[PDB]
Structure formats: structure tokens, C-alpha cells
């Protein structure tokens, strides 16, 4: 889970 | 007209605080989305997809309670659980100020040129002149519960505030020869008022939306005090935005559909429903060109809907 990733 | 049923983008929003009263997203005039995720603020540049962790809270327990970009998009105001209103320079990636004045978390923010207004869980609103040493230049006290909606009109002539005390206050732009007293106090919503948005093409027209116990969108003329329209949305109304290009409004909702609703103005007819979120919508923000609406929701996603364009 990477913040703001698509 | 054709409105896409799918969002243009879906961004991950891990650890987004599922607190209805907070205002955790804002899209800058420079096309950068600021997203508060728990104790950090992330910036997403819409044109490049570049992501920056702008800041992280330094104390245990601390979380971000609000974010708002200044008009030019080079400074970001950040309200915190520790009652701070921080001013960040995003070009330098540095904190310029850490303004204290509030007695509780700052869940709402709104700029009027260099004046930044902040609303707190205490019910007070403070005006901060961010250019000067004693930043705290005014205190507006018209709420007995958390100030969750706060919005200066685009012409700067009025400031609207909505609270967890079911009130909407419309304040003047200056105290003049009297004091800081509301020009209007609307008590008709029977729930918290987080949704507050001014009509971009009519100076005195305001839209507000109430929580679960209210479920209505109301349109007001703040000069005459008239309630021009009251529509039941069948759910809490977390946010409202106006499209200046299409003469429409868009609202975000919770139980049971967790949808966005597009309404034609002034008829208030339902144009479309944007479905996809699996938990309540928390906030909406609009791109600087007016084409895209970002919805942040308790399902830990930010959905970007290009609902006001065909290209």
C-alpha cells in the first residue's frame, strides 16, 4: 500500500 | 449530456481518518492534490503523478485535521489535532509557521487572500494574518460545537461556517464599527453542517448540506435570508461543490449508496449518480480547471471523477 498510488 | 460512470483515477488513501468532521483533501490552483493520511500530508501532482510526503506529525497521537491551499497554490495550511495551524511552503518543502491560538483540533480552514480562517472543535473561528508576528487578529464565536464547514465566498464579502451544533452562520468580511456578529444564522438544518459552498456566479448564493439526521441540501440567499430550495438527498451530505461551467452542483454522501449526486441548477433535478465507493464519502474537492472532482472516502480511496468534461 503506497499512499496516493494508482 | 454524457457523464462517465467510472472515475478517471483511483488513488490509494491508506489510513485515511474516518472522522466526518475533518477536511482532509484540497486541490490547489497549481493542480496539486494535498491529502492528509493519519499523521502525514501527501502531495500528488495531477499532471505528472509525482507523490511527495510533505510532512509528518512529530508527536505520538497527533494527526492532521485539515488542509487548505492558499489561492496561488504555493502555501498549504495544515490544521492539527494538537490545535496548531501550520503554514507550509511546498516549493521549499518547509514549515514557515506553527500558529497556535486554538484550544482544540482545527478541523476546518478557508483562505481569503492572506487571511486564513480556522475552525475548531471548541466552536471558535480564528482569523490569522499569516504575514505578521501576532497572526491571531480576530475571533468569531457563533458555534457551541465543532466548526466542520468553513468557506469564504469567492468575492470575499462573506464567510460561511457550519457546525456540529446544526447551525450555519454567515459572517461579514470585517467587524466595522460593531463587533464580530453573524449577518445570518440559519437553524433549519437538523444535523451537523459540513457541506458549505458558494455559487461561483451569484455573490450571495450559498449551498449547505446536513448530516445523517438532516439529509438535506439547502440553497440560500445570504442577503435576504431566503431559503431558495431544500432537497432531501436521503443520506448525510458531506460536501457540495458547484460546477461554474455546467450550472450544476455535486454532493457526496454516505449510507446507503456512498455515492456522489450531480444536480442541475436551478431546478435541483437529479442529473446523475456516481457510484463505486464501498464506505461513506468524507470530502470532495474540485480540480482548478473545474473538470474533475476528487472524492475521498472511508474505503481508503480517492476517486477522481472527470464528471464535468468530455475533452
Numbering used by the authors:
A (entry chain B): 1 to 6
B (entry chain A): 166 to 476
Original paper wording:
Here we explore peptide inhibitors of Cdc20, a substrate-recognition subunit and activator of the E3 ubiquitin ligase the anaphase-promoting complex/cyclosome (APC/C) that is essential in mitosis and consequently of interest as an anti-cancer target. APC/C engages substrates via degrons that include the ‘destruction box’ (D-box) motif. We used a rational design approach to construct binders containing unnatural amino acids aimed at better filling a hydrophobic pocket that contributes to the D-box binding site on the surface of Cdc20.
As expected, the structure–activity relationship (SAR) held true between all peptides, whereby incorporation of the unnatural amino acid increased the binding affinity over 6-fold versus the respective parental peptide. Building on this success, we further explored the commercially available halogenated analog, (S)–2-amino-4,4,4-trifluorobutanoic acid (F3), leading to peptide D21. We attempted these soaking experiments with our four highest affinity peptides, D21, D20, D7, and D19 (in order of highest affinity to lowest) and were able to observe sufficient ligand density for all but D19. The crystal structures of Cdc20WD40 in complex with each of the other three D-box peptides show that they bound to Cdc20WD40 at the canonical D-box degron binding site, with a largely similar topology to the S. cerevisiae Acm1-Cdh1 structure (overlay of D21 with Acm1 D-box). The guanidino group of the P1 arginine residue of the D-box peptides forms hydrogen bonds with the carboxylate side chains of Asp177 and Glu465 of Cdc20WD40. Additionally, the carbonyl of S5 belonging to D21/D20 forms a H-bond with the nitrogen backbone atom of Asp177. Interestingly, the observed electron density of the peptide correlates with Cdc20 binding affinity: D21 and D20, having the highest affinities, display the clearest electron density allowing six amino acids to be modelled, whereas D7 shows relatively poor density permitting modelling of only four residues.
